[PDB]
Subunit: 116 residues, 4 copies
C-alpha cells in the first residue's frame, strides 16, 4: 500500500487502536476533498487507505482523530487532532508511512517515505 498510517500511544506504550484517520486531498480549487479514511487496527496500523492508482500526486492531509482517542481513555488532550499535510508523489510514486506518536499534550508525526 502506498499510504500507511501508524499511531502509537506514548502514555501506554501501545499501538493506538481504533483511532480514526481521515485523508483529504487538495482539489484544484484549494478545497480539501475527502480522499480516504479508516481506523487503526489492533497493531495501531491503518493499511489499505488507498491504492497506487488512486494515490496520485497532490497535497494530502491526514487528520488523525487523536482527541476521540484520548477522550475514550478519559484524558482531555490538548490537540483536536494530529495532522499531516504533505505533497505526495512529486518525483514519482512513493510508499508513505505516517507514524504519529501521541501524548495528551504532544504528538509527533513522522514520515517514512520509501521508493517502491
Amino acid at each position: 500500500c502506498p499510504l500507511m498510517v501508524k499511531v502509537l500511544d506514548a502514555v501506554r506504550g501501545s499501538p493506538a487502536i481504533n483511532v480514526a484517520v481521515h485523508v483529504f486531498r487538495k482539489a484544484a480549487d484549494d478545497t480539501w476533498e475527502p480522499f480516504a479514511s479508516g481506523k487503526t487496527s489492533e497493531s495501531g496500523e491503518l493499511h489499505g487507505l488507498t491504492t497506487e492508482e488512486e494515490f496520485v500526486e497532490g497535497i494530502y492531509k491526514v487528520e488523525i482523530d487523536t482527541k476521540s482517542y484520548w477522550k475514550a481513555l478519559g484524558i482531555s488532550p490538548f490537540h483536536e487532532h494530529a495532522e499531516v499535510v504533505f505533497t505526495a508523489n512529486d518525483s514519482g510514486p512513493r510508499r508513505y508511512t505516517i507514524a504519529a506518536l501521541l501524548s495528551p499534550y504532544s504528538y509527533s508525526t513522522t514520515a517514512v517515505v520509501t521508493n517502491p
Copy 2:
C-alpha cells in the same frame, strides 16, 4: 501573552528563526478565520500573537510554515507545514506555549499550558 509559539530546528539544534506562523480561529461555519501571525524571532519564539482579551475559548489552528523554513536551508521537507489544532480551554488562568520541534521528515508539537 496568552499564546506563544516556539519553533526549534532539530537538524541544526537551533531556534528555527523567521518561521512564519499563522493562527486561525475556527469560525461558526467550520472555516478557519485568520486571527494572528508572525515570524519566529532569533530565539525561535513568536510572542505577542494575541492578548488575553482576544484569546477567547475556541478552536485554534496554528500553522507553522515548516516547508519554507526547510527550503531556506536547502533541505527537502516532508510536510507542507506543521498544523497545531487545539481548543483554548480557558478554565484559567492559562498561558499556552506551543513548541514545535522540526525535522525535515518529522515534527513534534507540544503544548506547555501553565498558570
Copy 3:
C-alpha cells in the same frame, strides 16, 4: 522476538539503516553486562537481538550508535548515542519494540510494549 529496535532517520524520512545497537543488562553488582548487539536492517529494524529465554527480568540499556550513523552521512550530530534504559519483564514477559526517531540534534525513543 521479545526485543526489537527500530530506528528512523527524521531528516531523510527513511529507516536508519546499519545503525549499531548495543544492549546491556544491569548485573547484580550494578555494572552493565553486554547483553546483545546488532545492526538495523534495510527496514531500520533490528530483530533477533535476544530470545524469550535469554531476555529475563532486569534493567536493560539499549545504546543506539546514532553518532556513527549521522557521521557516515556527513552530519555532526549532538548526541553520542540514543539510549533507552528500562526495566524489562517486571510483571512477566513482554514484547518490546524500541523506536528511535533520529535528528542530528534531537531524538525520541518510544517503547511499544505488548503482551505476547
Copy 4:
C-alpha cells in the same frame, strides 16, 4: 549559564517540575564522573548547573530521573531515566539547552545550541 536542562511533561502539558537531573563528565577511564545536578524548577528548567570555566569540552551525560517523576504522578513509566549523552564542542561561543519532552513510554530530547 552554558548548560540548561528543560523538562516538559507531554501528558499534562506542563513543565516537569522537581525532576532530578544529574550531569556527568566522561572520565579518562571511560567512567562517568558526577559533575552537576539539580531539580527542575517550577518552569521545568534547571539553571546554574555549571559555569563557562567548568564546562570544558568533553563527553557529558545528562541523566534525567524521569522514572521518579512519573511515579510521583502515579503513571507507570517505561524508562528508568532519560539519558542525554553528548560532546560539548566548544567551537564557540556555545549555550546548550537540553529539552526533554517526557511521556510515560516515550521521550524526546533536543539540544538547542546557540551563540
